[PDB]
Amino acid sequence: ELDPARTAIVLIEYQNEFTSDGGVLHGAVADVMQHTGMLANTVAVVDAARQAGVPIMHAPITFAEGYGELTRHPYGILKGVVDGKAFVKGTWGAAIVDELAPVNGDIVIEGKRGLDTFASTNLDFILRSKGVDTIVLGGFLTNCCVESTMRTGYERGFRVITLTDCVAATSQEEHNNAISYDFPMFSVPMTSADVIAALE
């Protein structure tokens, strides 16, 4: 049961870096993108969201070239972002995949530098200003940025819905476990089809 005036689709990091052949991180997520069909499922969800008047918010991650916005000695996941030169601002890799290119009305969330969309962006501000209380999440990575964003969403009292087949990760094991164990603690897990049915 969805209220379009009080709902948003939040698309996390559908960027060529992940989504597209030649992306620095594409090879690592290919298998799961294939098994899930997340890309086409995401396209379908967005289409039904445009029609129902539900805003699309894209949340890309980017970094000024040289990574000066971060510690010179990162640890954990962002270390990989630095060493691999992923998501440099203004590059093909940082661009949102052509199939989901932002179009009239859509909101591109700004500032993302870490994994939790709510920790370095204007997402919370915009969601709250627009009176949105239900967020629908899709994107990358299932057990990293989608999971962090979902957990903070819950903390902040949104109704979080996670699109269990519009997410993808670097391994099927990591992907499946996130969805089976953690998603139910912090969200309402649903398929594109049921979200699509709910949007209509």
The least distance separating a second copy from the CB of residue 18, rounded to whole angstroms, comes to: 15
- Cβ proximity to a second copy, 22 vs 184, nearer residue: 184
Q: Beginning with the edge strand found earlier in the chain, give each strand of the sheet holding 56-59 in spatial order.
A: 107-108, 56-59, 7-12, 134-140, 159-168, 188-190
- Cβ proximity to a second copy, 76 vs 200, nearer residue: 76
Nearest to 26 by CA among 90, 74, 98, 97: 97
Longest dimension (CA), the chain: 48
**3-state SS class at 105:** coil
- Cβ proximity to a second copy, 112 vs 138, nearer residue: 112
The least distance separating a second copy from the CB of residue 35, rounded to whole angstroms, comes to: 17
The least distance separating a second copy from the CB of residue 49, rounded to whole angstroms, comes to: 15
The least distance separating a second copy from the CB of residue 40, rounded to whole angstroms, comes to: 26
Residue pair 150/159 in contact by the 8 Å Cβ criterion: no
Which spans of this chain sit near a second copy (rule: CB under 8 A)? 55, 64, 66, 68-71, 74-77, 105, 107-116, 119-122, 124-131, 133, 143-144, 147-148, 151-152, 154-159, 171, 173-174, 177, 181-182, 184-188
- Cβ proximity to a second copy, 48 vs 160, nearer residue: 160
- Cβ proximity to a second copy, 40 vs 124, nearer residue: 124
DSSP-derived pairing of the beta strands 188-190 and 134-140: unpaired
The Cβ of residue 111 has, within 10 Å, a number of other Cβ atoms equal to: 14
The least distance separating a second copy from the CB of residue 17, rounded to whole angstroms, comes to: 17
| Contacts (Cβ under 8 Å, ≥6 apart) of 76 | none
